[PDB]
Amino acid sequence: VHLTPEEKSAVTALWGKVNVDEVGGEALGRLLVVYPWTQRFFESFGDLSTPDAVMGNPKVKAHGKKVLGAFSDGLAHLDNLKGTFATLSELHCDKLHVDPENFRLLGNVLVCVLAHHFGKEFTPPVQAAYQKVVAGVANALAHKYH
Amino acid sequence: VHLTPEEKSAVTALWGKVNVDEVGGEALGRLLVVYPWTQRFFESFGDLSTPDAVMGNPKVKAHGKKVLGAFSDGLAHLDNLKGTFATLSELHCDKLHVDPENFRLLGNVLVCVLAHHFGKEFTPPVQAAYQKVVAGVANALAHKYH
Amino acid sequence: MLSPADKTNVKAAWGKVGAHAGEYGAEALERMFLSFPTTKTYFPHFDLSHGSAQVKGHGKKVADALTNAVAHVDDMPNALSALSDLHAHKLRVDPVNFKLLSHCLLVTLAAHLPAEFTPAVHASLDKFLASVSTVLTSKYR
Amino acid sequence: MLSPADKTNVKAAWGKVGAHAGEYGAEALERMFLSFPTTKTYFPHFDLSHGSAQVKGHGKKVADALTNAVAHVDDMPNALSALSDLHAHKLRVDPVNFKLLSHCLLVTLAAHLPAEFTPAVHASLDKFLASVSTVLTSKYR
Numbered sequence: 061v062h063l064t065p066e067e068k069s070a071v072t073a074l075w076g077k078v079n080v081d082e083v084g085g086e087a088l089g090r091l092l093v094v095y096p097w098t099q100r101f102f103e104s105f106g107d108l109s110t111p112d113a114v115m116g117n118p119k120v121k122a123h124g125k126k127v128l129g130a131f132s133d134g135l136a137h138l139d140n141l142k143g144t145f146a147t148l149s150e151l152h153c154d155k156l157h158v159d160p161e162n163f164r165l166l167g168n169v170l171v172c173v174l175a176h177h178f179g180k181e182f183t184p185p186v187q188a189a190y191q192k193v194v195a196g197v198a199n200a201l202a203h204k205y206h
Numbered sequence: 207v208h209l210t211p212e213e214k215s216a217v218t219a220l221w222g223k224v225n226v227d228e229v230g231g232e233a234l235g236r237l238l239v240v241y242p243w244t245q246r247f248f249e250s251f252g253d254l255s256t257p258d259a260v261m262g263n264p265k266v267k268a269h270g271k272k273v274l275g276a277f278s279d280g281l282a283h284l285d286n287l288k289g290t291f292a293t294l295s296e297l298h299c300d301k302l303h304v305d306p307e308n309f310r311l312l313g314n315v316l317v318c319v320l321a322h323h324f325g326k327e328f329t330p331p332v333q334a335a336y337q338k339v340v341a342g343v344a345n346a347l348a349h350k351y352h
Numbered sequence: 353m354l355s356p357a358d359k360t361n362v363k364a365a366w367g368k369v370g371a372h373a374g375e376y377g378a379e380a381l382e383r384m385f386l387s388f389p390t391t392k393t394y395f396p397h398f399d400l401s402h403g404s405a406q407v408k409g410h411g412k413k414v415a416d417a418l419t420n421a422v423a424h425v426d427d428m429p430n431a432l433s434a435l436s437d438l439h440a441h442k443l444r445v446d447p448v449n450f451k452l453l454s455h456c457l458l459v460t461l462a463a464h465l466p467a468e469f470t471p472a473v474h475a476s477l478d479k480f481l482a483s484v485s486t487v488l489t490s491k492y493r
Numbered sequence: 494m495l496s497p498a499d500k501t502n503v504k505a506a507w508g509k510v511g512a513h514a515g516e517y518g519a520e521a522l523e524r525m526f527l528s529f530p531t532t533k534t535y536f537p538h539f540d541l542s543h544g545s546a547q548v549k550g551h552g553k554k555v556a557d558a559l560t561n562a563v564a565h566v567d568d569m570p571n572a573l574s575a576l577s578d579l580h581a582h583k584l585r586v587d588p589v590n591f592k593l594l595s596h597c598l599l600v601t602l603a604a605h606l607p608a609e610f611t612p613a614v615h616a617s618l619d620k621f622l623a624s625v626s627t628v629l630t631s632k633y634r
């Protein structure tokens with residue numbers, strides 16, 4: 061993505077304060093709670109019967125760490141997301157059968173999680189920068205769909 | 207856009223049979239009928255109160271011809287839609303204040319009109335080629351928005 | 353909000369579909385898979401090739417459901433209750449996809465009903481498919 | 494469809510907003526103009542600079558409307574009737590834009606309600622905003 065130098069530093073600076081594993085579990089759990097149809101891929105995870113069950117499920121938390129860890133690594137390649145996520149795009153399409161709309165939902169849930177975590181430090185301009193990143197990653201993951 | 211040689215030929219072959227004047231007027235009139243909120247940009251055009259009023263309005267027909275004519279030009283520069291529409295992108299944003307979502311609606315109404323006009327010749331593969339083109343054009347026109 | 357003229361328009365157009373409703377349903381699906389490839393993610397278990405009997409079979413199921421919706425245009429929520437439960441709780445198709453099929457159904461109707469697909473009818477059909485879509489996704493959450 | 498628990502969650506969260514409803518309303522608009530610049534197309538007549546009285550006043554009118562809807566959560570259609578007509582017949586804002594403002598209103602609430610913004614409340618607020626959006630666009634066509 062095309063972020064101004066200012067935008068890149070705002071992203072990087074907040075990210076440095078993130079507990080990846082924690083936010084990962086929170087974002088994934090909140091996606092499954094707020095948009096329940098997303099639970100369709102996770103029937104092997106066990107009990108997703110209530111918000112509490114979802115947020116507390118160790119399988120959800122483990123998957124959230126895996127997803128955000130990859131996300132986290134992509135922040136180093138802001139300039140080459142398509143390339144960085146190409147293989148994962150292919151995997152998500154050909155083997156996993158994940159509708160790319162799920163990537164967009166996760167990106168909005170991630171922005172709400174950061175807002176909740178950071179409060180006032182998540183200013184309108186810092187949000188805008190993260191919006192570009194989350195759209196960029198969603199696009200990069202949807203790129204190889206066919 | 208990235209069209210296979212077969213999509214490019216499908217696109218080009220059908221477009222040689224299009225009467226731009228006529229299809230232009232039909233497409234713009236159907237947009238104003240089907241998604242009437244779009245009439246907000248055409249307050250000075252006269253009577254837009256009924257479908258019949260919309261469809262026989264000469265200002266609608268004229269504008270429709272201008273728009274499709276410009277659309278025809280991008281068909282000649284399929285490899286550089288953004289460069290082709292840059293000036294028009296800035297016009298629509300800065301002077302006209304048109305929400306780019308309107309470009310997407312028009313793209314879909316156009317598809318409907320080609321199917322209505324061409325019948326059985328507008329096959330599933332031809333449509334698919336057109337859908338990539340109208341998305342491309344919509345994106346090219348929203349590119350300079352800020 | 354389907355007005356009496358919208359209802360009239362839909363019953364008329366659907367009337368003319370008649371017996372071809374199943375063939376039009378299959379064609380709509382084919383247009384959808386080709387134009388919006390992300391929709392293929394919900395049918396990993398189907399042969400999506402042109403002429404596929406699985407697509408033809410599914411097309412008939414979809415068209416029949418629409419026929420039932422037209423018949424009960426005044427009581428759609430009850431008529432499609434079982435299909436709303438199905439989509440919300442088992443299939444779990446993202447709501448965004450309903451708009452893509454609706455568009456493809458419109459293109460199919462246009463291509464087959466030259467005379468009947470007037471601007472007024474096109475508007476009524478779009479409103480009707482949006483109502484069906486709303487009903488189908490009403491129990492998602 | 495809002496469950497009774499949804500209604501309870503909204504009332505509880507909105508209650509906490511309280512007196513800051515207008516200030517939050519203004520921040521949500523600013524977050525929307527920055528994140529989704531295409532929404533600026535509907536405000537060419539406004540000074541959209543940070544802290545403008547036009548944005549502050551509009552923010553207040555938006556919050557008041559949401560307050561009215563929480564108050565009358567069981568009959569939103571009637572409650573927002575006037576607003577529903579204005580948006581359908583005068584403003585004519587494309588329906589997509591309602592989802593972008595809803596997203597920015599959710600982010601604003603998250604940033605200001607650390608205690609209350611649990612997963613269940615987040616779900617209920619999302620659904621509430623979607624219902625308001627549906628009522629506001631219900632008379633478009």
Ligand code: HEM
Pocket residue numbers: 098101102126127128130131148151152156158162163166197201
């Ligand atoms: C930022 C967006 C995302 C990123 C970076 C991402 C990344 C990953 C990675 C790194 C893996 C493991 C690949 C491997 O097994 O080598 C994975 C697997 C998977 N992802 Fe994605 N993912 C994202 C979003 C999603 C979403 C939104 C869903 C569904 C709602 C999803 C569903 C899955 C599933 C079902 C698997 C397989 C898990 C398993 O087999 O244990 N992903 N993803």
Ligand code: HEM
Pocket residue numbers: 244247248269272273274276277294298302304308309312343347
């Ligand atoms: C295919 C996409 C489109 C193309 C290529 C296009 C092209 C054009 C062109 C060539 C002009 C003439 C500029 C001039 O000489 O003043 C124009 C003007 C205009 N267009 Fe677009 N247009 C498109 C879509 C739309 C849509 C969807 C809307 C709104 C629904 C729209 C609203 C307008 C308006 C309001 C004007 C000014 C008419 C006037 O001068 O009163 N356009 N456009």
Ligand code: HEM
Pocket residue numbers: 391394395410413414417418435438439443445449450453454484485488
């Ligand atoms: C107008 C909208 C729709 C209608 C009326 C409709 C109707 C139906 C019907 C009647 C069935 C068969 C249920 C059964 O097996 O008894 C079904 C199943 C299914 N639908 Fe929907 N549907 C609609 C939209 C969608 C969309 C947009 C998608 C995804 C792109 C979708 C995906 C599916 C899938 C995957 C199945 C199960 C197929 C199988 O395994 O046989 N549906 N639908």
Ligand code: HEM
Pocket residue numbers: 532535536551554555558559576579580584586590591592594595625626629
């Ligand atoms: C939760 C969704 C929304 C609510 C509750 C809402 C509410 C309102 C209210 C209360 C007013 C003022 C009416 C008056 O002054 O009499 C208004 C006006 C307006 N709204 Fe909406 N609105 C919403 C969404 C939107 C969206 C998404 C946009 C465009 C992006 C928008 C654009 C406008 C505009 C341009 C005006 C007129 C501004 C002026 O000239 O003062 N609204 N809205």
